Design a protein around this ligand. Sequence first.
Ligand SMILES: CCCCCCCC/C=C\CCCCCCCC(=O)OC[C@@H](O)CO
Ligand SMILES: CCCCCCCC/C=C\CCCCCCCC(=O)OC[C@H](O)CO
Ligand SMILES: CCCCCCCC/C=C\CCCCCCCC(=O)OC[C@H](O)CO
Ligand SMILES: [Ca+2]
Ligand SMILES: [Ca+2]
Ligand SMILES: [Ca+2]
Ligand SMILES: [Cl-]
Ligand SMILES: [Cl-]
Ligand SMILES: [Cl-]
Ligand SMILES: [Cl-]
Ligand SMILES: [Cl-]
Ligand code: NA
Ligand code: NA
Ligand SMILES: [Zn+2]
Length: 467
Amino acid sequence: LFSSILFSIATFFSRILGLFRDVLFAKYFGVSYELDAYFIAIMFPFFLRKVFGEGAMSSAFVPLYSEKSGEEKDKFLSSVINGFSLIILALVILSYFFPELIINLFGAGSSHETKILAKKLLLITSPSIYFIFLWAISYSILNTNNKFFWPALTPSISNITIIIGTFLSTKYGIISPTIGFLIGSILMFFSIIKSIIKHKYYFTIKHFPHFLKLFFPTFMTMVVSQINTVVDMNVVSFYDKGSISYLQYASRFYLLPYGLFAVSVSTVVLSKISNDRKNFNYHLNDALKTTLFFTIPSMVGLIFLSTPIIRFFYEHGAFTSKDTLITSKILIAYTLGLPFYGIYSTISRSYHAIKNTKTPFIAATIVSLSNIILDIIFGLKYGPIGVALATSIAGIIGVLYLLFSVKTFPIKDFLKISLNSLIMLFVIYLTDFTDNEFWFLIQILIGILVYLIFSSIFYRDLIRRFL
Ligand SMILES: CCCCCCCC/C=C\CCCCCCCC(=O)OC[C@@H](O)CO
Ligand SMILES: CCCCCCCC/C=C\CCCCCCCC(=O)OC[C@H](O)CO
Ligand SMILES: CCCCCCCC/C=C\CCCCCCCC(=O)OC[C@H](O)CO
Ligand SMILES: [Ca+2]
Ligand SMILES: [Ca+2]
Ligand SMILES: [Ca+2]
Ligand SMILES: [Cl-]
Ligand SMILES: [Cl-]
Ligand SMILES: [Cl-]
Ligand SMILES: [Cl-]
Ligand SMILES: [Cl-]
Ligand code: NA
Ligand code: NA
Ligand SMILES: [Zn+2]
């Protein structure tokens, strides 16, 4: 368990480091066409990391690597590296000659000056793909040797190098964090290079067709399942300049309470279902109560305090009062979906825990199609706020489908949690007088205390049994 607590500390600071990276973007670049161009240029390697984070490489590499032995293991590894090196080299050369293909994938609607700059930055980011693939392969090898802690922290390397590049941007401009992104991908790979170079190199691609047969179907499935990322960005690119940047500032901050409250708090309770499948309904209700307990007060507090929170973190240097006003509205639009995505995540993973992949797949399809259609309608009409809202409404639709499916929900506890959250709201509203820029921190503490006090009143009998 000591490694589990250590990994939580490591994850917290890794999340905070990403937040600090964005804080510096706001200070050194604010919201601008030039940061739009940066995000366009990094989005393909970023997107590819996300897909490999869902297991796209390990899903095929692990079984085919582990089944082999002796120098057939080296020959398999060489086949994978050689085959991908060939494909990637071809596509980086094509990227140099036709950068508009990648640009128009993520920023088709962006202005002329944006696309020109993104072309220049893509010359630097496109090679990072090669080092991301190698990183993903080494990551898989480490996983087959039961190494999980340290490989999971290597993305922090890239955030440090981007941060350093952002500091140097006062001399070079936006190209400095772009170079930092490339160097980050190189050093991420070098941090775990030994797992690859301990193998003998073979001039062979013998096993590459075998590996592709198992890799590509799953890889494409994971591409499609993460596509809403691409659609969000491409739709907003048609709005005002800086729209891409607004969406990144708001969504990257929102992912902090999302990851904590909509997913992580309910994991332990959800873990029990696999071992105790015949009590599925009880355990699912238990997990849903936990999710609601955290997401409902968090949603209320975040929305009420969205402007002072954004101001505290982002409103420095080039990030203006106007930027705070807009980013805060986008954050509210996302935060309205927090409890719905919490419920969604809880029911979906509970289904997986009992080997039902069909119902989670249908729900995910509904959410994805809903999100695309609503992006078209609301995103083209209202820019980033419309895209954020579309994402939240899509989650509501997914929740309605899943609730009709499991036909269970802890209604009594939802009402108790909601009342405690509204009592909390009433109190924080009363403490809203000073307008000091740091007062929102005290209101968060007051809100937590009020919420837990009244939680203990309404759950007194339950606390006694636990205590
Ligand atoms: C070579 C294709 C590059 C595609 C375009 C990106 C440009 C990259 C530039 C330089 C790459 C140098 C890094 C080379 C990294 C080492 C390659 C490797 O993994 O070898 C493993 C074997 O020894 C064991 O199987
Ligand atoms: C600008 C740099 C961009 C670099 C982007 C690198 C992405 C490469 C990913 C996969 C290999 C693609 C080649 C796939 C070849 C076809 C695979 C195949 O044959 O799959 C058969 C399957 O059974 C039928 O469903
Ligand atoms: C996330 C929860 C943990 C965070 C813990 C942070 C600890 C508190 C830090 C700073 C408080 C600063 C509060 C400053 C309040 C302003 C006081 C003031 O000067 O108010 C003037 C006005 O006239 C009144 O009437
Ligand atoms: Ca600006
Ligand atoms: Ca060997
Ligand atoms: Ca300020
Ligand atoms: Cl601008
Ligand atoms: Cl072996
Ligand atoms: Cl970034
Ligand atoms: Cl194979
Ligand atoms: Cl084989
Ligand atoms: Na500017
Ligand atoms: Na426009
Ligand atoms: Zn093979």
